[PDB]
């Protein structure tokens, strides 16, 4: 996902918003600079990609940079972002979140339940070369009440995690229904 | 060279039969000459075994019927190896019997001469597909083969 990057300086923060240009910042160990990216362009780019896929940023210098959305500040009250962060990479190992896919239906939902996915992404310490678009998780034999922890995932070559190997990826939860409602509001 | 009136669908065994419902509120309030119309029912189930034959009845324009004996529903071929007399109440979580994808291959050659399906490789998934939504699964070996 590419996106045209623009340079901001003294320009007042809000006024940029009145241009549909959401203000922002790129930076890292060897750099710091103010920026501002068009909201519509950003949106289309972000939705699909988010904080997993890497987004290159083209400056008025003919520069292509391998940035990542470290964080993004949103305006509570009508979900809409005020400020974005971009982390410039190089080729040294780096931490970031990677997406998740859960194939097949567990012995839970297939019988009668609901898939309670706790994460949609896991934290990994990996180099800009390796940036897996998804991590397979064979959630087939997950009976109602069981769960798959961080200690059993499809870790591709040279991709060691970053969170506790005891942290839980997700869980198979009980379906709530009306048959409960007689006992719930009862005792 | 013949006249008809209306189509009606009935379910009943082959050979043993009486005017009892739901065949009652059927050929009863419309009249039926079961004096000779049944001498063609005992010659049509003479050497034919028992089952649940839905003879596709189509009331003529002369107050008769087109007794064309068809092949039993795909709910009788599955409980033919399970011995049961019904089906599973929730096809999904519970499993009454676990037949084979082999018994579906030679009980379906009894369901093609009437059904509108050509070869049998398609008639293998019809009897194994109508079994899916009734509470029973199978197991195979050959399959696609391919490369």
């Amino acid at each position: 996902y590419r996106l045209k990057a623009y340079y901001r300086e003294g320009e007042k923060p809000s006024a940029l918003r009145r241009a549909g240009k959401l203000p922002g910042v790129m930076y890292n160990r060897h750099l710091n600079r103010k920026v501002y990216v068009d909201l519509v362009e950003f949106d289309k780019v972000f939705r699909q990609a988010s904080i997993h896929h890497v987004i290159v940023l083209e400056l008025p210098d003919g520069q292509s940079l391998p940035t990542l959305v470290r964080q993004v500040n949103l305006d509570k009250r009508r979900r809409r972002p005020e400020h974005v962060d971009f982390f410039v990479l190089s080729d040294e190992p780096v931490e970031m979140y990677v997406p998740l896919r859960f194939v097949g239906t567990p012995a839970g939902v297939r019988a009668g339940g609901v898939l309670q996915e706790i994460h949609r992404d896991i934290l990994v310490k990996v180099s800009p070369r390796n940036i897996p678009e998804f991590i397979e998780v064979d959630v087939s034999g997950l009976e109602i009440g069981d769960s798959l922890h961080a200690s059993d995932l499809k870790l591709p070559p040279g991709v060691e995690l970053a969170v506790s190997p005891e942290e839980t990826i997700a869980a198979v939860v009980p379906p709530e229904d009306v048959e409960k409602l007689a006992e719930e509001a009862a005792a | 060279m013949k006249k008809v009136v209306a189509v009606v669908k009935l379910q009943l065994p082959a050979g043993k039969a009486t005017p009892a419902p739901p065949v009652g509120p059927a050929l009863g309030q419309h009249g039926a000459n079961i004096m000779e119309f049944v001498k063609a029912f005992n010659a049509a189930t003479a050497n034919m075994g028992d089952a649940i034959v839905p003879v596709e009845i189509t009331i003529y324009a002369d107050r008769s019927f087109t007794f064309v004996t068809k092949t039993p529903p795909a709910s009788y071929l599955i409980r033919k190896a399970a011995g049961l007399e019904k089906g599973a109440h929730k096809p999904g979580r519970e499993k009454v019997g676990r037949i084979t994808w082999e018994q579906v291959l030679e009980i379906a050659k009894q369901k093609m001469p009437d059904l509108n399906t050509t070869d049998l490789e398609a008639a293998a998934r019809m009897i194994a597909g109508s079994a899916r939504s009734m509470g029973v699964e199978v197991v195979g070996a050959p399959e696609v083969k391919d490369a």
Binding site: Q71, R79, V114, P175, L181 | -
Partner: protein, 134 residues
């Protein structure tokens, strides 16, 4: 519950921290107006939603009423309200997520929350998930 006794009124100042991001489930329901949601209000929603999709998906009540709503017994001025008539409330400020659903397709988790909002005083706005995480 434990806490301790009756608390003061307060003021529904702005929207500041009153606001979130969908954390659990596929869709979401959030508040556009500041207000004092009650217990039985939330309950009025809890039920309706489940009565919609019996044997359906799992519901998450993200907000929680720990503010003692006080009241007075039909007279006048001696002492402060024995209150607790309505019970305990939640300070809900615009942008705040209130009801998360899952295990239900659009048409399900859409006609589920909307109904909720109608057992709800303020105005609401169902939500997808875009991608805005953290």
């Amino acid at each position: 519950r434990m806490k301790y006794r009756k608390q003061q009124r307060g003021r529904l100042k702005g929207a500041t921290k009153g606001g979130d991001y969908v954390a659990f489930g596929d869709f979401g329901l959030v508040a556009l107006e500041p207000a004092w949601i009650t217990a039985q209000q939330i309950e009025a929603a809890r039920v309706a939603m489940v009565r919609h999709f019996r044997r359906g998906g799992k519901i998450f009540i993200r907000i929680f009423p720990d503010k003692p709503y006080t009241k007075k017994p039909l007279e006048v001025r001696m002492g402060k309200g024995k209150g607790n008539v309505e019970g305990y409330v939640a300070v809900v400020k615009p942008g705040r997520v209130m009801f998360e659903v899952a295990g239900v397709t659009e048409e399900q988790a859409m006609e589920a929350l909307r109904i909720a909002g109608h057992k709800l005083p303020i105005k609401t706005k169902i939500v997808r998930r875009d991608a805005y995480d953290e």
